[PDB]
Paper text:
The N-terminal ExoN domain of nsp14 improves RNA synthesis fidelity by removing misincorporated nucleotides or nucleotide analogs from the nascent RNA, whereas the C-terminal N7-MTase domain is involved in the 5′ capping processes of the viral genomic and subgenomic mRNAs. The ExoN activity of nsp14 is stimulated by nsp10, which binds to the ExoN domain and helps stabilize the architecture of the ExoN active site. However, the efficacy of nucleotide analog inhibitors on coronavirus RdRp is compromised by the presence of the viral nsp14 exoribonuclease (ExoN), an RNA proofreader that is specific to coronaviruses and a few other closely related virus families of the Nidovirales order and crucial to maintain the integrity of their unusually large RNA genome.
The ExoN active site, which is located in the nsp14 ExoN domain and supported by the N terminus of nsp10, binds the 3′ end of the RNA, separating it from the 5′ overhang. Most of the RNA helix remains freely accessible in the solvent-exposed space. The binding mode of nsp8 to the nsp10-nsp14-RNA complex suggests that nsp8 may help stabilize substrate binding for ExoN-mediated RNA cleavage. As a common component in both ExoN and RdRp complexes, nsp8 may play a role in RNA substrate transfer between the two enzymes.
Author numbering:
A (entry chain B): 1 to 454, 465 to 523
B (entry chain A): 1 to 131
Write the structure that this text describes.
Amino acid sequence: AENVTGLFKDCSKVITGLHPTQAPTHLSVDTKFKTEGLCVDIPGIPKDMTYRRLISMMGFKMNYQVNGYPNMFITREEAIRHVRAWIGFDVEGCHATREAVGTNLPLQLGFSTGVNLVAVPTGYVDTPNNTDFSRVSAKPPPGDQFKHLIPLMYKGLPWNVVRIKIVQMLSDTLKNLSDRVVFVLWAHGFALTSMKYFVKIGPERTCCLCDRRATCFSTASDTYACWHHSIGFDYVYNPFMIDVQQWGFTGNLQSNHDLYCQVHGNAHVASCDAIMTRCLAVHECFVKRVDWTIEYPIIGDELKINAACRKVQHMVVKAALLADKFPVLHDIGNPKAIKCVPQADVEWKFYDAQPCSDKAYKIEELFYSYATHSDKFTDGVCLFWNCNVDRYPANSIVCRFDTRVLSNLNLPGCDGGSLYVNKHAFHTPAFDKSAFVNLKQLPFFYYSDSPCESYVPLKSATCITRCNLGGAVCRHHANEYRLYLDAYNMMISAGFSLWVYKQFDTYNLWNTF
Amino acid sequence: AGNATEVPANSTVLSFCAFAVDAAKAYKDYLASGGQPITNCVKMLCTHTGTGQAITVTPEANMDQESFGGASCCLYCRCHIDHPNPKGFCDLKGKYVQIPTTCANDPVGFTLKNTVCTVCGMWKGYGCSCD
RNA sequence: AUGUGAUUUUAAUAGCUUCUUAGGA
RNA sequence: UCCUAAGAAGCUAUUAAAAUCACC
Ligand SMILES: [Mg+2]
Ligand SMILES: [Mg+2]
Ligand SMILES: [Zn+2]
Ligand SMILES: [Zn+2]
Ligand SMILES: [Zn+2]
Ligand SMILES: [Zn+2]
Ligand SMILES: [Zn+2]
């Protein structure tokens, strides 16, 4: 252990060492030649011409700082900013048993995508003339903890077919999410060893035939590609990785995931450890509270979905207030104090979760739980807009994100709840029916006090205006109804689900006229 | 299990050079930006009196030349990746490299930049006398 | 001989420093 | 006041064994 490392550790079982030439370092020369730190050329001992030594690619240390070359590992204030590009990664290994002992070649790779890739055991065997990347003999790990790697060593694909089904899975997942990949690892010690095989870091490059960042390398034709143009490109160009065990975690993976989540399981399979490694790393960064400082790029419909939500929220709240005449209206989870319907008579008690960077409007601080506050708010109606409470009371206007809808916005997350990353990161919990045992669904309708001014005539009882009640429907409200329908359908497509109290009556809006 | 080959002084530059699309350029850029050369090269206690040539079967070292073992003056043999030479075979592995002692604190970075004169066996520009 | 590390101890071995005793200057 | 030999203590390093934690 005198200034040595486990990297490139010769794992052969030949008793002799190496010749003075054809030896990579000074520590690999045999004892017959090594004299006072300066090897001697004995003309008697000839050099080996036929030998194969399995070099162990274990213990890579990516702590380099070079000027043009980006760093692989990232800080968890730069990995929370790239959350669309998290792909968990866990690698199961097989130990070398015949003619080589001492290194774990990779057998089973697994990602957060859900794809297990078996590979043949393949290692870097250092022949006299080159480093012959080739199949070595291996045994699967010992014990009844690893018994599903007993059949896997008799199947799999070579590493020039498991290098192109990693740039066909990453490229199909992250085609539309992001333009980099952040490999969330549990213990980087073996994930780096298993990334020597399909990763080529290099200077920051730009895609061929295109203008996006270059994230896929092709060794056959020496070019680079972004995540769209990578058809046939085999080597992943600069990834970024992150180690979750270096966030102060003491214990196993299934004894650190199973404290936050009861949905995932079946550990020590690669696709179910790479899912837990990302589940634990989404929890430890996002489930605490939404961080309002970290903006996010605009993938698609971010401007339209949010403005449509504001439009429909301005409508449903004002409609329910003008229809049922609630004396006071509460508010929960509204970070700022921004009155949705400011032109109202109700007193807007901002029962926020926590005061956020301003007390100019005296937002109150209160946390909500069902068994605690089931009988605390009895007066009026409480607008739980985008709140995450376990169960809602019997008088509310709720808008909860239905976390079972999958899109390029709604990334998978912890405890079956998901991360809806739209101009901010919201880790909304699982959409269960038990939350809505005091509520009903909301009908679709449009209600306005704007006087009518003087194309297809549309007759729908859902629209609530004195013009559609008459014989002729004005063109001053048909486009309004169509815009509102477009906003509502875009909202429902986005994944929200509106809910309302039991006594909500759409005919109560009519007597207002 | 296994007989260790590397030192922790190398495990920053070797790892970074194991992953590289171009291994020579990445090592030159590591050398430029605050980088220590690859230590632990194999060195020959030669008679140090011999005619100078780049690549020989036995170390023939001039008075201005340190003769190293030819597997530790090749970055690709030293990072265990594939040589860019066609037929993928190393030319330096098996023969003894002669590095001029003025630039022999960093052997690996000499064989990347310099070349061997084909007609007189000397390091071109470092004693090749073809005027 | 059958996998990779990391941290503690417990043995020897080597080096340095401090203290005690003895010999010499 | 200095040099050498022995004993004790401390620090560091090398090998060996054991124990714990993570990876497999
Ligand atoms: Mg793992
Ligand atoms: Mg695992
Ligand atoms: Zn492209
Ligand atoms: Zn989970
Ligand atoms: Zn009208
Ligand atoms: Zn070589
Ligand atoms: Zn010449």
